[PDB]
Design a protein around this nucleic acid. Structure first.
Ligand SMILES: Nc1ncnc2c1ncn2[C@@H]1O[C@H](CSCC[C@H](N)C(=O)O)[C@@H](O)[C@H]1O
Ligand SMILES: Nc1ncnc2c1ncn2[C@@H]1O[C@H](CSCC[C@H](N)C(=O)O)[C@@H](O)[C@H]1O
Lengths: 122, 375, 227, 375, 227, 122
RNA sequence: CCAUGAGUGU
RNA sequence: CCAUGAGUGU
RNA sequence: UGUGAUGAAACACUCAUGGUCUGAAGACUCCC
RNA sequence: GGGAGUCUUGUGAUGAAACACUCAUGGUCUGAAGA
């Protein structure tokens, strides 16, 4: 897919889905592309999670561009059904956002730092 | 480890300490620098940088920009980037000076003369590709269309008030502004009105009779030819604007299908353009959530709600979509919400490239509307 | 009429035919005005009237800005240069020695900035997004003053980011806080407090905080030093 | 002593008690009754009344209307009038009935059928003479002129924003809207401008060169002929409207000198008409004190001051008078007060028939202005 | 849908498809409406929906007007007939028996009153100024109701003047008090008190005073009896 | 003059000028055509006095029309200089108004009744 | 609608 | 500007 | 200079930038 | 009233103040000083 900027290994993808679940429980998340958008536009989001199997690709294509302007890190997962079902929904979701990590702070900080390494940085 | 710098000045390699290990000076040519700066934006390295990475043979290099990394990896090197690095700062701290040291200019006096003219030319170039975007014309056109709409109505309102001094009964007899104007334009005086000349525009048997009888029994004023032609100037202007309007619609349709086909599939050229106008551009419309798109227009109503915690608008400029304003008041908010959602997707497929998928979008939308209507 | 120096370099006050006092600057391009401003000759030297209602800097001065970090030969990065109103006055103040780098991302307006910057070797126009200092990294040098007047909700953060790129250690930042374009809902006075805290929680040393009223509604300007 | 009544029903004489001493019934004719009612407004007695005052030979008669008195004195009788007299009431209390008694109609059924159609015909007649006033056309025309003014400005602002996609530098180079429009209209593409076609507008040698060089080095957009003609539609409409405006000014001048020569002498056709349009008529303008005429327009400003006891406006639509808006702020109040003062006088000589005295009025005004300015 | 009589002659209420209640009158000219109002058939009889937001009389009714002196075969003098909105409804109420004399001095508006009064034998239009009852003395008779809705500072005085001309002794006057066109500066509530005093200081016997709110802002209607 | 509706005998004209003077002292008057106009428009005036020698006649011509609409009685005097100099001015006046008679109530009520008689009435 | 910067018309 | 009555355009 | 001195907030538009709703439910059907 | 399933739904359910104009009528500064 073309709106996917970099490569996420499955270990990281699983650590992301975990991070989201703990954040439902102990913090505050936003679920769905529109709500994720508003979370970036408002600067509330600490981490943005985008699914790789969105079916018209362009639905989430604006997020990489938007997150870079607001300097909010974003990450990919492979299944939208899996992200939504993480999110506490019984339906799929195309993108989500973590606003407050709560009991996942340590878990998120490792993610936002692994995606830095496999992006360039130091 | 070599920290690499790119600047108007050329390509400079620093060590971790902040000492120039090696440099390659750029040519003092406005044309080539501007182009390489425009190219650098997309991640393309300077040609001075390519030569520099050969002269030095570094194992681990670190650049300023994250877009460059994959380009230099494709060229053979192991690469990373540091944003606001100490090195990059060290370079700019001595930048009035190191222009002379690497012999980019003889003195400070005409480093700044050159840089001034580079900046002038570099923004002149950007200003141009901004102007060259096709959506801007779509926006201007609809904005003028809206001006024309507004004016037609202002003039028609005036004309009826004015012309009714002479023939008051004609105002409640002709609903349609264009028709009303055609009559004053072709006739002036009410005693110039004929079964023949009125048939010659397609007014129906029965109506022609009611007009002529009303003109016969009119309690209007008898008035000079100077007075009537004054009025007729307005009538002809009104007629002119209607034609200009119809021309603008076809033009608008042409551009709108080209620039944002999926959006146009959903709401038509005019309303589509109208959303672009409020958003500012297509890419701006594309970046929006549905919940914004749903309220564009209606800013007074929105911020009133947001300041006070009152009830928000269900719909902004979107009100114009036939399915909304014709539907009963309890259906409208749902229809609006469904439309906006689809429009956001439409704008995004339109923005981030190409494909027409407006047919399924319409189909999905009409499904949602049919459900709303069965309650 | 009478023109005389003030506490700040290249910034003058006028006594008038009627007895009014207005700020002005020394005209770098004599015979030529950028907006509609009055040109004034006194002892064969020309000055440009500095209307406070248009220029936030002139406002801040008239509201008692302790010490102005913009003077002869200063290097300034000007975020949000717009049509060139205020930046033309900092060009006058800075003189041929110093340099102003005007960043502005609205083409409709950079259009009119161009005209200002053609006439003035001081000013280096840039059509770029202040959110990405990488896109002008390659034209600018480090600076003494970071003058930041941009309508953005995260304006402060943008300013800090540019600062750690371009602002010299111990340099100064004049930051304009636009309450109504950060959030029209919140109280302007709550906003000024929370934004200043962002500067302090970075490492900017708040020197002075001015309220731009009469001249600019729901605006405050902060002067602070980067460490 | 005979109390005399005039009605659609005819002319009746009553004693002080309220008994019909004698009557003369009117003819049941729409035409004649309407005319005598219209005539009665001016004081003219019914012809049924003339005949009745002969049959009875009364020494002291008393009528309903004060305008009739001098007419009936000229006819030979000693006469007075009582407004809401007991007798006039006594008559009307039995007015459903006494129509039958004096045989104006056979039954109630077609007394009302007739009265209805009289009222219909009587107002129809008044409706006509109201429409036939010459000042109403002055009002409509200036209103349409203010519409055109408004539109010219709206379109010209639109056009400049629009055409600036192609040739942005032309905007600040042409101050005048009409000139700007002529360029976009006559040329089209920026690369179609030519020297002699430009010399033809009135452009001096030097300007032609600046425009052409601006077009050569232009950082505008390269654009299709479809796009340009779209813009050119607005340009041609602008130009049209400028001609229509000038045509309307001349038409207006003609009517204004005819209908209000003294006012016209003072403030010109347009501003005089404008004042008529805010007042509603010339007869309404005349009835105004200067302190009203001075602030017409400016109502938002006025009622703000009246509600809060703050500072009132110095001038309303009168601001447009050259002497005011060019004068310094402290002189404006006095010039306005003086103008309004003369305007009121001008309006009154204009309204109540008086032949042109605008010359001495202007002279009186310019004297007052010259004094104001010498301080 | 259901239509049924109210306490007042020829005035009815509707139960609606949804459960709202709106006033209406029996349509004297079936199939034909004067403003945009809804026409409603029920048991083969047609009613015109009486919008309270437009007609001050309907407004007064919905604000609990004790007894309505306008009924079957009433003679009413109606000062300020305007376009014919309300007067058409009193036409319906009064029926072919009674009569309504509509005084109105604005030609732009009597234009549209004509159309109403053509279709309606009840209504006798008059393009005349209500300040001079002399100029319609010759067409009208005496009357049971003086319905007065005229925009004039001295509207109350005008009404009284017409009253002693045309209002039967023991007849009724419905007088609309328009605060903001008597004086925009004064408090609407001061005005209501002072204008009612004028009626009492003549000899009108105040029966009921209603405030037309929701339906009309800064308005009141007085019902009183002439002696 | 043509704006003069009826004939005022000089005995009355003098009783008018007298009524005004007492009204300056004990009540409230308005002096000047524009201030007289406002007094009628506002319905404050009980008696309106107009001069017969105004020199463009039309300056006060609107007062008879205005006074009849608002049903305020008006009267004429022969000299404008005499009326102004009554008014407590040293310059002429074309028209004046009495708003509150004060110690001229009886004097005014006789005037507004004499002008009624020489007008028609009873 | 609020704020900022730039302008237009009678 | 406030109020009342009548209407128009997208 | 009361045929108006003195005081004293004329009206209509355009462009650019930012501030731009809510967030999980709703509708059906079958067994006793 | 207890139990059970099916359809649509984060690619958005539910709730919820779109914008621009015209006409008519009335409310429409101060009041004797100034060089
Ligand atoms: N992200 C961004 N980058 C650069 N400029 C921006 C920006 N966001 C807003 N702006 C600009 O900030 C400007 C606000 S107006 C600034 C006024 C100007 N400094 C003066 O005093 O004369 C606008 O022109 C706007 O285009
Ligand atoms: N002096 C006067 N004589 C007659 N009509 C007058 C008047 N002054 C004002 N009016 C009229 O009074 C009207 C107020 S509108 C009245 C509304 C109408 N009765 C209805 O309810 O449907 C206006 O049409 C106005 O022209």
């Amino acid at each position: 897919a073309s709106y996917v900027k970099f490569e996420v290994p499955q270990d990281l993808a699983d650590k992301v889905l975990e991070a989201v679940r703990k954040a439902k429980e102990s913090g505050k998340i936003k679920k769905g592309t529109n709500e994720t958008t508003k979370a970036v536009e408002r600067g509330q989001a600490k981490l943005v999670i985008i699914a790789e199997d969105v079916q018209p690709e362009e639905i989430v294509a604006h997020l990489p561009l938007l997150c870079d302007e607001k300097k909010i890190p974003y990450v990919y997962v492979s299944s939208k059904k899996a992200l939504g079902e993480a999110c506490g929904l019984q339906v799929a979701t195309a993108s989500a956002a973590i606003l407050e990590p709560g009991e996942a702070k340590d878990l998120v900080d490792e993610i936002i730092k692994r995606v830095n390494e496999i992006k360039g940085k130091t | 480890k070599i920290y690499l710098i790119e600047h108007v000045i050329g390509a400079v390699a620093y060590d971790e300490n902040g000492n120039i290990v090696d440099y390659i000076t750029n040519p003092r040519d406005l044309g080539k620098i501007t182009e390489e700066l425009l190219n650098n934006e997309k991640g393309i390295p300077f040609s001075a940088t390519v030569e520099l990475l050969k002269k030095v043979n570094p194992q681990e290099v670190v650049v300023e920009n994250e877009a460059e990394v994959p380009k230099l990896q494709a060229l053979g090197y192991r690469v990373s980037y540091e944003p606001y690095s100490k090195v990059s700062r060290i370079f700019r701290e001595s930048l009035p000076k190191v222009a002379i040291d690497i012999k980019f200019a003889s003195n400070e006096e005409d480093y700044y003369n050159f840089l001034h003219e580079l900046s002038l030319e570099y923004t002149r170039r950007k200003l141009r590709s901004a102007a060259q975007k096709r959506d801007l014309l779509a926006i201007q056109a609809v904005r003028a269309m809206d001006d024309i709409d507004k004016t037609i109505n202002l003039f028609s309102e005036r004309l009826r008030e004015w012309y009714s001094i002479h023939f008051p009964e004609l105002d409640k007899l002709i609903e349609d502004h264009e028709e009303y104007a055609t009559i004053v334009s072709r006739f002036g005086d009410r005693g110039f009105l004929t079964i023949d000349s009125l048939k010659e525009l397609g007014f129906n048997e029965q109506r022609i009779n009611r007009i002529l009888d009303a003109a016969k029994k009119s309690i209007g004023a008898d008035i000079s030819e100077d007075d009537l032609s004054a009025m007729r100037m307005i009538a002809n202007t009104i007629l002119d604007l209607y034609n200009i309007r119809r021309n603008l619609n076809n033009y608008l349709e042409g551009v709108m299908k080209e620039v944002a086909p999926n959006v146009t599939a959903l709401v038509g050229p005019a309303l589509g353009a109208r959303l672009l106008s409020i958003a500012g551009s297509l890419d701006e419309l594309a970046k929006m959530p549905a919940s914004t798109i749903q309220v564009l227009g209606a800013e007074k109503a929105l911020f009133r709600a947001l300041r006070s915690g009152g009830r928000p608008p269900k719909h902004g400029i979107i009100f114009q979509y036939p399915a909304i304003h014709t539907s009963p008041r309890w259906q409208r908010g749902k229809i609006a919400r469904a439309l906006a959602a689809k429009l956001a997707i439409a704008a995004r497929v339109d923005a981030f490239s190409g494909r027409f998928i407006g047919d399924q979008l319409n189909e999905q939308l009409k499904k949602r509307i049919d459900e709303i209507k069965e309650k | 009429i009478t023109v005389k120096q003030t506490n700040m370099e290249n910034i003058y006050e006028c006594e008038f035919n009627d007895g009014s006092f207005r700020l002005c600057t020394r005209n770098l391009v004599p015979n030529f005005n950028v907006y509609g401003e009055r040109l004034i000759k006194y002892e064969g030297v020309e000055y440009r009237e500095w209307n406070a209602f248009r220029s936030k800097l002139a406002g801040a001065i008239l509201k008692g800005l302790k010490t102005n970090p913009i003077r002869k030969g200063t290097k300034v990065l000007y975020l949000g240069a717009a049509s060139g109103t205020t930046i033309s006055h900092v060009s006058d103040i800075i003189e041929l020695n110093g340099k102003a780098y005007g960043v502005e991302f609205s083409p409709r307006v950079v259009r009119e900035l161009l005209l200002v910057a053609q006439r003035r070797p001081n000013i280096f126009p840039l059509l770029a997004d202040a959110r990405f200092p990488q896109s002008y990294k390659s034209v600018v040098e480090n600076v003494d003053v970071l003058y930041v007047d941009i309508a953005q909700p995260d304006q402060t953060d943008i300013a800090i980011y540019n600062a750690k790129f371009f602002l010299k250690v111990n340099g100064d930042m004049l930051l304009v806080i636009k309450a109504r374009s950060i959030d029209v809902t919140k109280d302007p006075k709550e906003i000024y407090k929370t934004e200043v805290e962002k500067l302090e929680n970075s490492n900017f040393e708040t020197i002075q905080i001015i309220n731009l009223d009469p001249y600019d509604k729901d605006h405050a300007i902060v002067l602070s030093k980067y460490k």
